[PDB]
């Protein structure tokens, strides 16, 4: 039975990096050539493996980030997305694939539905997802649920706009992590 990669890649709606989606691909056969030979990808970075196997489980994590932020979807990277949104491990065996989504995820006036965490006290551990909407305490006084000075909402929108520069344009990113699944 073929692996359901189309569902992840051709999904109508992707998710915010803060709440990235994970699809477990198990008990299936997969041709990775079709994906590589699509030619629709800006980034096809594979770490620990060549273009060419067999793995216990395959995970397909998917989200939307800016183009200037795809660099952070790699092992050993630092930044707001890597540190506080999605982290790839230093020991990473897998492939990171990406494409521009301006036509789909950008709206005149801006798309305020894709959010990110700008505020977190600590860097995220690998493959951790924080979906907390708690108000951040940037100072001594406890925030107590009220936004204000030193009391701020941790999640912010990208406001993707079609006139945005490509680096600030939305990119759809699928991370294939290799941990039932074999090539043809």
């Amino acid at each position, epitope marked *: 039975n073929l692996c359901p990669f189309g569902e992840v890649f051709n999904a109508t709606r992707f998710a915010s990096v803060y709440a990235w989606n994970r699809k477990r691909i198990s008990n299936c056969v997969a041709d990775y050539s079709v994906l590589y030979n699509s030619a629709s990808f800006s980034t096809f970075k594979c770490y620990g493996v060549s273009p060419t196997l067999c793995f216990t489980n395959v995970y397909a994590d998917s989200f939307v980030i800016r183009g200037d932020e795809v660099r952070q979807i790699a092992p050993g990277q630092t*930044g707001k997305i890597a540190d506080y949104n999605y982290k790839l491990p230093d020991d990473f065996t897998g492939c990171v694939i990406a494409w521009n989504s301006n036509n789909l995820d950008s709206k005149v006036g801006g798309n305020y539905n894709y959010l990110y965490r700008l505020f977190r006290k600590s860097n995220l551990k690998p493959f951790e997802r924080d979906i907390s909407t708690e108000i*951040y305490q*940037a100072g001594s006084t406890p925030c107590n649920g009220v936004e204000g000075f030193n009391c701020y909402f941790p999640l912010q929108s990208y406001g993707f*706009q079609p*006139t*945005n*520069g490509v680096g600030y344009q939305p990119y759809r990113v699928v991370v294939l992590s290799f941990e039932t699944v074999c090539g043809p």
Partner: antibody
Amino acid sequence: VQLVESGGGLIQPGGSLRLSCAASGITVSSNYMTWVRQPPGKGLEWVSVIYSGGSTFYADPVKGRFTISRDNSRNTLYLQMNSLRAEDTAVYYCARDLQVYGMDVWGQGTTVTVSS
Amino acid sequence: IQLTQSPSFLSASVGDRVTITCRASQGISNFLAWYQQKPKAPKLLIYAASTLQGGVPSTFSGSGSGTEFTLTISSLQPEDFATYYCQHLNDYPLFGGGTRVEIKR
């Protein structure tokens, strides 16, 4: 409330100086903390930033020469400037960068002069 | 990646309307801030192109999205005479050349 800067002085090319920013009303560790410089008569330029999680980023001109640091106990931010050059002469400002809400709290400034 | 603040020097009188323009090389949406420096620490006036920081007088306004942004003072007042800087809000912060508002004579 207040960000207080200290440490500026006269130094010669190749020298090292450390600047201090003491904070009240904000927590240096809990916030993105930045260093911005105004070369004399030339306007504002970014130098470095420390993130809440420890990630440090630096401007290409000061990349191998400067280090941003913090002490949570003293609520103090630091910039260690080494291999100093004349072009590094400026008033050095410390700020708290709420990134999408702007750099709201700024320090008074400390002047660094590098001359032979 | 390139921000140009157009009126480097502006001359005006109290009660006048002053418009300062910041242009970006590429579209940056609403990611810009406006700052005032008297000769002493920059002060934040506007964040997100149009949002006033607290305490800033209503005479101060921000407009713009994409490539062109403008700061407008409805009536210049004595303390408003100063230098104004536009900043791009990005992981790598960029400031504009600056605009000096001077008394007309």
